[PDB]
Amino acid sequence: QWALEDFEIGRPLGKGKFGNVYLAREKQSKFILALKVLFKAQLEKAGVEHQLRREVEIQSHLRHPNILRLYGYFHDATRVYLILEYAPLGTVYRELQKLSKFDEQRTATYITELANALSYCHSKRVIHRDIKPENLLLGSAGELKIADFGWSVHAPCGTLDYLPPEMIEGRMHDEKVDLWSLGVLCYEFLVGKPPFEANTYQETYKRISRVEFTFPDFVTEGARDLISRLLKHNPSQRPMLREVLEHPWITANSSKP
Ligand SMILES: Nc1nc(Nc2ccc(S(N)(=O)=O)cc2)nn1C(=O)c1c(F)cccc1F
Numbered sequence: 001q002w003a004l005e006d007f008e009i010g011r012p013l014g015k016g017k018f019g020n021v022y023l024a025r026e027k028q029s030k031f032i033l034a035l036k037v038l039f040k041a042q043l044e045k046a047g048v049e050h051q052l053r054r055e056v057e058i059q060s061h062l063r064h065p066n067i068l069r070l071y072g073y074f075h076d077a078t079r080v081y082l083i084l085e086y087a088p089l090g091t092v093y094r095e096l097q098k099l100s101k102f103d104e105q106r107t108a109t110y111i112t113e114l115a116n117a118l119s120y121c122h123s124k125r126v127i128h129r130d131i132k133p134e135n136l137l138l139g140s141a142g143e144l145k146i147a148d149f150g151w152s153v154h155a156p157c158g159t160l161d162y163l164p165p166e167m168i169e170g171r172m173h174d175e176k177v178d179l180w181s182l183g184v185l186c187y188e189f190l191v192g193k194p195p196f197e198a199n200t201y202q203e204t205y206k207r208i209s210r211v212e213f214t215f216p217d218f219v220t221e222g223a224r225d226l227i228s229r230l231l232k233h234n235p236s237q238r239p240m241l242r243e244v245l246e247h248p249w250i251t252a253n254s255s256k257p
């Protein structure tokens with residue numbers, strides 16, 4: 001079905017994290033795509049073979065314009081190869097480094113595209129558990145695409161910044177975990193840093209478990225209301241995705257087709 005001889009490999013798009021992503025082209029069709037090349041050595045040492053197979057299994061079945069497509073996979077005696085959609089405008093992470101912070105318009109748009117992808121995800125019982133700017137890509141029209149379904153699973157670690165209390169405490173969690181992540185993102189998009197950031201993991205753990213965030217002066221009340229409602233300790237007290245898409249701050253600042 002698939003072999004390395006089928007593609008022409010090009011420029012690096014990112015680095016592992018175990019393995020790199022390279023720009024590539026399929027020889028037969030001239031189809032431009034991105035090839036993630038993971039090493040079996042590193043994958044064994046971390047014990048993630050079951051998790052990656054699980055990721056590929058989940059990600060290959062999903063179809064949404066705000067979820068990055070996986071077209072297929074293959075492997076060699078030494079490496080596993082993933083055939084991904086190439087997002088031409090890069091990471092939201094790099095966008096945010098360039099502008100420092102986003103305006104309400106861009107943020108509300110990104111949150112709408114994000115909630116939509118999550119409604120679709122939850123409607124197949126899949127919970128991402130890992131939304132963060134480095135895992136969000138931008139298509140050719142500047143539309144947001146979710147990328148790394150590695151730590152995803154059916155409902156109901158590096159930096160803790162995006163994880164909710166119930167997760168960092170090891171408590172049972174379900175779909176409402178992604179609602180927290182949205183609030184963290186909405187905060188970081190407007191402020192330029194996540195709300196429980198810190199110089200140490202131990203402090204970030206304290207900050208999250210206690211829900212210790214303050215808003216800078218430029219954050220408007222509509223944004224302060226949506227963020228505050230999302231950043232609740234109690235998962236059942238977080239709103240639904242419907243409620244988020246219909247929030248007055250969102251509806252007054254987002255975009256549509
Ligand atoms: N699938 C995919 N497409 C892209 N497009 C891309 C990425 C970076 C740039 S650039 N020159 O650094 O600004 C330009 C285009 N990245 N990508 C990935 O899987 C990917 C990822 F998810 C995280 C990190 C790196 C990646 F490569």
Ligand SMILES: O=C(O)c1cc(-c2cccc(Br)c2)nc2ccccc12
Pocket residue numbers: 040041043044049052053056073074075077080
């Ligand atoms: O040597 C193998 O047979 C092997 C295969 C794979 C593999 C094969 C196909 C798809 C995916 Br995802 C992963 N992952 C590994 C991950 C670690 C070690 C070995 C492997």
